[PDB]
DNA sequence: CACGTGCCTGGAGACTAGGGAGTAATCCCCTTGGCGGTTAAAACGCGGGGGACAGCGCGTACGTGCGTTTAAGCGGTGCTAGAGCTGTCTACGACCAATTGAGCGGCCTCGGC
DNA sequence: GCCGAGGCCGCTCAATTGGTCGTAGACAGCTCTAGCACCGCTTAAACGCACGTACGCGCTGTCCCCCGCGTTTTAACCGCCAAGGGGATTACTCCCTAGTCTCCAGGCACGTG
């Protein structure tokens, strides 16, 4: 069950709504691929740290505290998912 | 079963704003914020105790941690409140 | 803003390259989605500042590149 | 049988904070003025955050703080944003 | 070093006067502060140059520095 | 004493960074930025001096102050 | 009096570049670099034992600290070298 | 014999062991932790020294000076992110 | 979501017993201050040409609407992997006393920049 | 050619090796929660296409305002001396906090208008 081409699940309207919430009025057609790349890098960093925390505790499930600690390493404190 | 600062946060709210309440999720967020600040101050105080080879953590270590982790006016007001509390505790 | 299920699939795909046969909690995926949306909104705010700087209104990939350069992200 | 929180004039638990500082292995010894100084700094910080959140809620003609109102307290005051950095609140 | 030592030392003392009266400074402290300050200003000017190039310019104005600082996060 | 950071010093710092031409209003903004940076670092350093019951600011205090800001400095007693 | 990494760094230098020498200030910088990395990997190994109620710093904690501090390929090579060293030490 | 010869390392296992004991990092230190810092604090020194020597060769020198270390830190993508914004004295 | 009532686990009072922090005395380094000479760098004025900024016209590419197609959200069922907790035992690390050589300060000597 | 990198030498404060002791961690078992897989129907969101006009971008011109240069001013910098605060170390006496047991009420869950 190989997974591939799932980066296109971040559809054009999703990126466009995110930009609208950020104040962007006009979006060029080349922003979308760049947004996919940036999101992929961010997710790679966070997931790498979270998997490190998961494998420290001898687990096969990534939990909310792992992601919270991974984000906290990045200076992106997250509240409401435990602590 | 789990220790939380719900009663004390509720009391502080009832003092600052007598006509506003808190939702359960807001209490959870406030508890998380309090725990985060407590951990940030405790870890810094431990680091200062360790660097200077001090076995004990005193009020001066906590004062320095407060002045190092909080921004300016918050640090000044927090130092004033803490000194007031420590003086009132020692005297009485 | 992002559909839940495509984001879940993307997160699992990325996690596959780091540790195989991995399982997730729903709270973990929700936390990742919240953090990712916040990060993208902040990036778009800085991108809009960069676009305003250059006297235009349409944001372009060079704006993202400059914002991430100044931010220190690689 | 007066509590250490009553001797100082606080609502946060001095004894609980001391026990947290003793079982967290921050230092092998903890003084008598460190539990009374954090329990005041934390109370002041909770009061500040609750005051700003209540102001945000009152401006929105509501009388019960909800997680969105905390995200407007911390994202209007520069000091809180510098103290917490990039802070994301759930259901906000 | 690109900044003369005596003016920087006087500036550091003048700034420190507002945090505690009657301070003494070691020579090593002023040297470290000067090195850090020069490095910080050079990095800021690099970012300002990127901002100026973005706007199709070769002359940097204060708006470039403001944008660089704002994206960095120092000014808010 | 902020005027001691003169126009050619700022110009040399800018040239070190690759700037080709400098406007006339850059100098005041640069002085303000430098003041803010020094204020933060010196505040942290003075806090560290207070912790040690001292009346002198040492190199280690400045090194620690810059470490709090992600400005690791080497060669001054590390 | 003051213990320093001076002989060790020279020994490592005369393994990769046997013909290049090194100055005293470069000793200062490398010693500072080793100290910074050591306290990083020790602080993040103590915070992985405290937040687990574990009184021991095993090799597993050091590996997790290595994977959390160092960048990707650098971390992979470091964990490889550390595992090789621990295997050799346990075997002999 | 020594604890560094068992691991085949050029760095002091015992000195790191006491630095990780007397620093009050944890109550108990394992037997394999000092032989894991020493093996990680030697790969990093090896990498930095290799890059510094490469920089020294590029400048037609036989010695590593602070300037060479700063160049090695700045050119390497990974070492720059590990140390952040590092200013090296006399660089 | 406030408000009332029973319970049980943790905070408080009193006491004694070591050891860490306060506090006084001393030594001698490093900081601060003043002064005179030289001289490198900063300041001032000026002539000019490079570039910043406004205006204008073109044609590219975006946004909005509309009809169609995709697959996401939901609600049930089913099953099993593995998270969380408890109990028991063997192995590993702290401590302490004897042994012995690696590493730090000082020197003399000698070749890269 | 000569001053900062290299090798040699004596000397104390570690690192090791060896035993013993108590307890922390590895490991085996078991109970129930929750994460994954599947299916079917609904329908909201994504998608593709068409059309118009908003605006990115290249070109042109004009004024202004940085830059390089020559001259005069000024204050940084080096060298020297004095004098004295206070950083660094050590020796002592005493007050603070850890560990224990008795005493009891604050604070967690759970049922309520």
Author numbering:
A (entry chain B): 20 to 102
B (entry chain H), G (entry chain D): 58 to 149
C (entry chain A): 61 to 134
D (entry chain G): 15 to 106
E (entry chain E): 60 to 135
F (entry chain F): 25 to 102
H (entry chain C): 16 to 106
Can I see the authors' text?
The histone H2A variant H2A.W occupies transposons and thus prevents access to them in Arabidopsis thaliana. H2A.W is deposited by the chromatin remodeler DDM1, which also promotes the accessibility of chromatin writers to heterochromatin by an unknown mechanism. Chromatin remodeling factors are proteins harboring an ATPase domain, and promote the translocation of nucleosomal DNA by distorting histone-DNA interactions. We now report the cryo-electron microscopy (cryo-EM) structures of nucleosomes containing H2A and H2A.W, and the DDM1-H2A.W nucleosome complex.
A single-particle cryo-EM workflow was performed on the H2A- and H2A.W-nucleosomes, and both structures of nucleosomes containing H2A and H2A.W were determined at 2.9 Å resolution. Interestingly, in the H2A nucleosome, the entry/exit regions of nucleosomal DNA are disordered and only 113 base pairs (bps) of DNA are bound to the histone octamer. In the H2A nucleosome, we also found ambiguous cryo-EM density maps of the H2A C-terminal docking domain and the H3 αN helix. The histone-DNA contacts at the entry/exit regions of the nucleosomal DNA by the H3 αN helix are known to be supported by interactions with the H2A C-terminal docking domain. We thus conclude that Arabidopsis H2A might weaken the intra- and inter-histone interactions in the nucleosome, resulting in destabilized interactions between the H3 αN region and the entry/exit nucleosomal DNA in the H2A nucleosome. The structural comparison of the H2A and H2A.W nucleosomes suggested that the unique residues of Arabidopsis H2A might contribute to the unstable interaction between the docking domain and the H3 αN and α2 helices, resulting in the flexible nucleosomal DNA entry/exit regions in the H2A nucleosome compared to the H2A.W nucleosomes. The nucleosome containing H2A forms an open structure, caused by the loss of the interactions with the H3 αN and α2 helices. Notably, the sliding activity was detected in both H2A and H2A.W nucleosomes.
